[PDB]
Amino acid sequence: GASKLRAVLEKLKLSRDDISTAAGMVKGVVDHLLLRLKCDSAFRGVGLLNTGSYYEHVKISAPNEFDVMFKLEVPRIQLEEYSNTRAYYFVKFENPLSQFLEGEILSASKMLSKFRKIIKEEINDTDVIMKRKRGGSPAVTLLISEKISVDITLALESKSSWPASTQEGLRIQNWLSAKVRKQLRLKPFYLVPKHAEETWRLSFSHIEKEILNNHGKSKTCCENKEEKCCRKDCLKLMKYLLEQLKERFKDKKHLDKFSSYHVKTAFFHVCTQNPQDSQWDRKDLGLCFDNCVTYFLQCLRTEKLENYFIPEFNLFSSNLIDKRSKEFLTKQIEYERNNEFPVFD
Ligand SMILES: Cc1ccc(-c2cc(C(=O)O)c3[nH]c(CN4CCN(Cc5ccccc5)CC4)nc3c2)c(Cl)c1
Ligand SMILES: [Zn+2]
């Protein structure tokens, strides 16, 4: 444990907890968008994923940045792995999405261009302007007033068994048990637009809250005084460590490809590595956060960070992130641990 780390966590808790109208402004915009979308022939079956919450945030230090998902149920889906990528698929199949068919394969580009057209129109009809940024996921980014920012992703939902590329993924059997792994694999999966082309990426982002809210080997982890663990605290600190380094070097482009997602992935790989709750004692926050920082550094150096669900998908391959960018971050983190983590004060 370290006192500095707890002070950072106390600051992050107060920004998250204090009175804010922001969620209300976002709910207003989202509820309005959903109504204009449910009238469209193609987006009629659109539903907000997790209709009840605090809307989900991409940043632990930014209370004004929101992350939202609109899902479309896609029964009787045929998936085809593109170029042996393990995570990117062609979507094959009347139905409402038959309009976006280009032969047999579903067009994401055309679906996103339509989704954008409808949102861009609703923006004019409280001031909400669509941020100029263009990319498949998030499909849309809105700036509400001056401070509030909302990412909106359009995703396809499938209730069929997870694709074969996931068979060895979610290696939680020595931590959460074989019984829990089997229960989670019965949950749906998502397909989001992203190029490896008219390819969709497999997404399991919805599995995170399931694990975070029931994260111990003991069924009573964090339910009493005797069983207080630091797993959630280590993830918040790992995320905050990346966010602060990204902010510091925003004028350069060396940390542009790194995201909270990479930090989450490496963190859950440490959970598999250290499955016992005794390896996560609240008193050992310092050493636990150190095990996290060390593992992430090893990922950067070896250029290896497997998708937690798709083991043959390396998020740190040279083709996705060049070595110079990795070596830059490796140098910045190594500086932070050798200087009592200055980004935290
Ligand atoms: C044990 C475990 C479980 C889950 C994950 C996981 C996996 C994925 C994945 O893609 O498989 C993730 N992706 C991202 C970033 N996304 C940005 C866009 N958001 C849209 C949204 C917004 C609101 C409501 C739904 C959706 C969701 C969060 N964190 C992810 C985390 C990991 Cl690592 C380990
Ligand atoms: Zn716990």
UniProtKB/Swiss-Prot annotation:
A motif (Nuclear localization signal) lies at residues 127-137. The modification 5-glutamyl glutamate is found at residue 146. A motif (KRKR-loop) lies at residues 131-134. There is a cross-link at residues 71, 179, 209, 219, 304 (Glycyl lysine isopeptide (Lys-Gly) (interchain with G-Cter in SUMO)). The modification 5-glutamyl polyglutamate is found at residue 121. Changing residue 338 to A: Abollshed interaction with the SPSB3 component of the ECS(SPSB3) complex. The record marks 151-152 as: Cleavage. The keyword Membrane applies. Changing residue 260 to A: Decreased cyclic GMP-AMP synthase activity. This is Cyclic GMP-AMP synthase. The lineage of its organism: Eukaryota, Metazoa, Chordata, Craniata, Vertebrata. The gene is CGAS.
